[PDB]
């Protein structure tokens, strides 16, 4: 009969943390930013359109140099674009055409992808031969690869559909660490700027912050009412933003362990597929399923702009390291670069 | 443009041409998604050709088929089923030999899965090829175990034909908005090689329908 006692203890600890969070809450960020000058409207237009994909684009990632990018489509293709001149640098076939994530190594020597085959494939782009060959195939996830980001050239972190995250050493192809605790399917993964902590959003309406070196969850955030599909970090590493299928973005803070803002509108009934900040963190760009992106003021919770011009659901969007452009990849088999 | 810039453009055009050729070859290809319960029987339908999801490629009557099995994916279907929105057909394997076995009746679980997949928002006009497996076991089992266990409102003859037709009709009745949906029903016989041919016929119809969408008189 100790299960009931343990459940009561868990409820008591939940009440304790809720009381502590309520005691730490004094004034909302909206009240503080009621006196800061807003931006009336931003107007970003398409400077570049990248064509060549023959199926739905499911992921894209920028390079560190903010000129090269990698896009993944479910036609079995991973394309490296030179965004400046609309040039295709590499077209990598995949053994499995079911790809839901792609990553660019910070050094630019490797790319990664994965999906319904439960395998994270790492491809080497700088070979003595002129082709791009597969460097390794990390296996050991019982669910589909939802996201993957590069710690460095030898370390990778993967989010999967078996309610687990993993940290792999690429050279040995083995799981250095496994992060467990999520009740539902982990759908997103964002790395901190110092790249020592990472947040993962899952289908149990929960975002968890993990320490990579130690391997345990530091804090758990639960404000959403549906499955979180997108996660991203503030540029200062002390806050993050989550998008879910309840049509609401939410900005949480780490050192306060609360939610700071909610970005929602009564005219939006569709989910959020991907979110991304700006370089200064003033703008939050969120891709929706109603075929267009919305640009919110991160401190004023106002829809500062709309990025329309996609004929299908915006699956991914990214912002360059220097903040010069925003690249959106939707299901209409096109990528659009906005400035 | 400098010389290496022109050569880079030439490289881009070459791999664009290769991309177009690969896309045409993939567009000449028909897609089947295989679905069913664990004990329903799928290995009997993939053995008549002669971790992760599994692919089976075969060729019948100058037509290339890929069949995807997602039975090893123990996760939420609602987050990767839109990857199969463009498939030509979905094959659903339902066993007839497990009407009296509970593993909750597992045939009722098959009906629930069929209802969830058929009325999905991503499968508004995707054809169902319903294969009802284990007819010999059904004939050997219906002679002693009645169909009242799975269906209380049977009220019919306890023979093979009546019970089989009742089960088939109970599976057809789960199809809401059946004007734009078509369900093909076949009874799986192990000692025959015509089963894939049936799929071929069903597949052909979809192409014809798609061709009626191509010339603007669908």
């Amino acid at each position, epitope marked *: 009969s100790e299960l009931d006692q343990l459940r009561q203890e868990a409820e008591q600890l939940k009440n304790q943390i809720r009381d502590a969070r309520k005691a730490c809450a004094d004034a909302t960020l909206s009240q503080i930013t009621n006196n800061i000058d807003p931006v009336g409207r931003i107007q970003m237009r398409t400077r570049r359109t990248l064509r060549g994909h023959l199926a739905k684009i499911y992921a894209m990632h920028w390079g560190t140099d903010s*000129r090269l990018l990698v896009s993944a489509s479910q036609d079995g293709k991973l394309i490296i674009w030179d965004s400046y001149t609309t040039n295709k*640098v590499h077209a990598i076939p995949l053994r499995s055409s079911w790809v839901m994530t792609c990553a660019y190594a910070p050094s630019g020597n490797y790319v990664a992808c994965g999906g319904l085959d439960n395998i994270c494939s790492i491809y080497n782009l700088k070979t003595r031969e002129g082709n791009v060959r597969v460097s390794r195939e990390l296996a050991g996830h019982t669910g589909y690869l939802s996201c993957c980001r590069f710690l460095d050239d030898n370390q990778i972190v993967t989010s999967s559909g078996d309610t687990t995250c993993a940290l792999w050493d690429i050279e040995t192809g083995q799981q250095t660490t496994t992060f467990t605790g999520h009740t539902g399917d982990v759908m997103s993964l964002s790395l901190a700027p110092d790249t020592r902590l990472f947040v993962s959003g899952a289908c149990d309406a929960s975002a968890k912050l993990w320490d990579v070196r130690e391997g345990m969850c530091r804090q758990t955030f639960t404000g959403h009412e549906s499955d979180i599909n997108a996660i991203c970090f503030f540029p200062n590493g002390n806050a993050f933003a989550t998008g879910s299928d309840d049509a609401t973005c939410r900005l949480f803070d780490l050192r306060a362990d609360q939610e700071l803002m909610t970005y929602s509108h009564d005219n939006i009934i569709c989910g959020i597929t991907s979110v991304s900040f700006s370089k200064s963190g003033r703008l939050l760009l969120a891709g929706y399923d109603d075929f267009n992106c919305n640009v919110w003021d991160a401190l004023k919770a106002d829809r500062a702009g709309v990025l329309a011009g996609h004929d299908n659901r915006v699956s991914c969007l990214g912002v360059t390291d220097d903040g010069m452009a925003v690249a959106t990849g939707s299901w209409d088999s096109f990528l659009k670069i906005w400035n | 443009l400098s010389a290496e810039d022109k050569a880079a453009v*030439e490289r881009s055009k070459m791999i664009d041409r290769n991309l177009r050729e690969d896309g045409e070859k993939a567009a000449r290809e028909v897609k089947l998604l295989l679905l069913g319960a664990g004990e329903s029987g799928k290995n009997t339908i993939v053995k008549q050709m002669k971790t992760g999801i599994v692919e089976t490629h075969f060729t019948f009557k100058d037509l290339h088929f890929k069949m995807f099995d997602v039975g090893a994916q123990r996760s939420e279907r609602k987050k990767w089923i839109h990857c199969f929105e463009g498939v030509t057909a979905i094959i659903f394997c339902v066993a007839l030999s497990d009407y009296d076995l509970v593993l909750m009746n597992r045939m009722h679980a098959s009906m629930k899965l069929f209802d969830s997949i058929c009325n999905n928002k991503w499968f508004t006009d995707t054809s169902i090829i319903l294969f009802l497996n284990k007819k010999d076991l059904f004939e050997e089992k219906i002679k002693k175990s009645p169909l009242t266990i799975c269906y209380p409102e049977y009220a019919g003859s306890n023979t093979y034909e009546e019970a089989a037709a009742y089960i088939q009709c109970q599976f057809e009745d789960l199809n809401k908005r059946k004007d734009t949906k078509e369900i093909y029903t076949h009874f799986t016989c192990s000692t025959d090689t015509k089963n894939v041919q049936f799929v071929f016929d069903a597949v052909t119809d979809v192409i014809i329908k798609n061709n009626l969408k191509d010339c603007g008189l669908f």
Partner: single-chain antibody, 232 residues
Framework: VQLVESGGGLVQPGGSRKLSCSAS????????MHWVRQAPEKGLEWVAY????????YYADTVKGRFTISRDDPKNTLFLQMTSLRSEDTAMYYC??????????????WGQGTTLTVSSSDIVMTQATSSVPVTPGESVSISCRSS???????????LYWFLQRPGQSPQLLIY???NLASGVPDRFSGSGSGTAFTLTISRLEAEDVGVYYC?????????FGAGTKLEL
């Protein structure tokens, strides 16, 4: 990666000869291929270029209309048909592979070369230094001047630095005036602006004795320079 040359030999003027290059160890069909010749006592001059897919073909002015360059991709082999041979064609011929995309490594590998002997404007590229004595453990700077500025409007300076050891094929050191080559130690440094460029060896070893060449890739016909020999 092997680029083995074959053919060559002794011919009479007015004859014809086919030079063959067998490629192994790399994707031949994706690369562009250059034929570059070298006179018995002179430097390198560029002869011919075929692109990937055999779409773009360039020739030098002294060889136009007499030589043809072809490429068999299933056989992984490169041909140079040679007609109306004269006394200026006595040379050692080199096959060079070059791949062209963003952040590429052109002119990276050179074949051994084959010897052909017979019976008896554009950008002018100058290297003022010649036969410079050097000492081990000391830095040295090699200069290269151009008639036209190599700095394109896209921010790329199209200067390539090559090294030829005695009795050996040339090897690539610098791609575009700043960039080190793969397998090259961090002792060579490229710098310069406009028409004037320098290559600095910070610490000199015993394997750096050879002839250094600077080439332009801004526009065809891809002029090389003279030799900057250093041997001690």
């Amino acid at each position: 990666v092997q680029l083995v040359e074959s053919g060559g030999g002794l011919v009479q003027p007015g004859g014809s000869r086919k030079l063959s290059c067998s490629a192994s160890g790399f994707a031949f069909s994706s690369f562009g291929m250059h034929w570059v010749r070298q006179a018995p006592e002179k430097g390198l001059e560029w002869v011919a270029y075929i692109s990937s897919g055999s779409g773009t073909i360039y020739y030098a002015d002294t060889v136009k209309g007499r030589f043809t360059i072809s490429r068999d991709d299933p056989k992984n082999t490169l041909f140079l048909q040679m007609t109306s041979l004269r006394s200026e064609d006595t040379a050692m011929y080199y096959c060079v592979r070059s791949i062209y995309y963003y952040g590429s490594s052109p002119f990276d590998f050179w074949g051994q070369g084959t010897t052909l002997t017979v019976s008896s404007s554009d950008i002018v590229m100058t290297q003022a230094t010649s036969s410079v004595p050097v000492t081990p453990g000391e830095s040295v700077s090699i200069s290269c001047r151009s008639s036209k500025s190599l700095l394109h409007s896209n921010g790329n300076t199209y200067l390539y630095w090559f090294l030829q050891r005695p009795g050996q094929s040339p090897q690539l050191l610098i791609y575009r005036m700043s960039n080190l080559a793969s397998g090259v130690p961090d002792r060579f440094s490229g710098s310069g602006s406009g028409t004037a460029f320098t290559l600095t060896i910070s610490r000199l070893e015993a394997e750096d004795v050879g002839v250094y060449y600077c080439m332009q890739h801004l526009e065809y016909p891809l002029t090389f320079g003279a030799g900057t020999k250093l041997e001690l």
